[PDB]
Write a protein that binds this ligand. Structure first.
Ligand SMILES: [Zn+2]
Ligand SMILES: [Zn+2]
Ligand SMILES: [Zn+2]
Ligand SMILES: [Zn+2]
Ligand SMILES: [Zn+2]
Ligand SMILES: [Zn+2]
Ligand SMILES: [Zn+2]
Lengths: 73, 73, 71
């Protein structure tokens, strides 16, 4: 399962996930590529800010979904 | 940790999992190989139909366990 | 000899006992426009494989095949 993440450089990146891979895991995959620590990460999807504890299933993120990465002020 | 999945073609496939990798994750690994969407997947193990929410630990699936994949009508 | 192919509608194909599954996939392509590569046919729990024939699976007339996509 591969989802999409629009980063801070504009360019979109591709990450391989499991449907139960939580938001904290997704943020960790971003810092393994983008470099921005999860504490300074905010993930938006379909007008909803993703909470760390919840999973991709709870937010109904499916295959090839596009996530928008923004910097947590 | 590698478990076994008897698919719909008869031939058995091999998937690498974690003991906490839930059934929804296992089904996702199948559609990454077999092609059948998780919504149309039913997994049987030791006479028990595996529920999406539960994990491999809850059903006591151990290393080298064989899972039978059937098509959800 | 006609067989049914059901999904999720139901399309009907005019086939031959010696038609390979690859032939069946190509018929659906000429009917619903779906490429054979993204086709996976199942008859009675068993996913049919290209090369083997309808008679090889004892798929008689008026039998119902199930179409699953690999998009
Ligand atoms: Zn994948
Ligand atoms: Zn993961
Ligand atoms: Zn790492
Ligand atoms: Zn892991
Ligand atoms: Zn005929
Ligand atoms: Zn023919
Ligand atoms: Zn049937």
């Amino acid at each position: 399962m591969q989802i999409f993440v629009k980063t801070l450089t504009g360019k979109t990146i591709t990450l391989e996930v499991e449907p139960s891979d939580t938001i904290e895991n997704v943020k960790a995959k971003i810092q393994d590529k983008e470099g921005i620590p999860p504490d300074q990460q905010r993930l938006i999807f379909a007008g909803r800010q993703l909470e760390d504890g919840r999973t991709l299933s709870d937010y109904n993120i499916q295959k090839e979904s596009t996530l928008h990465l923004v910097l947590r002020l």
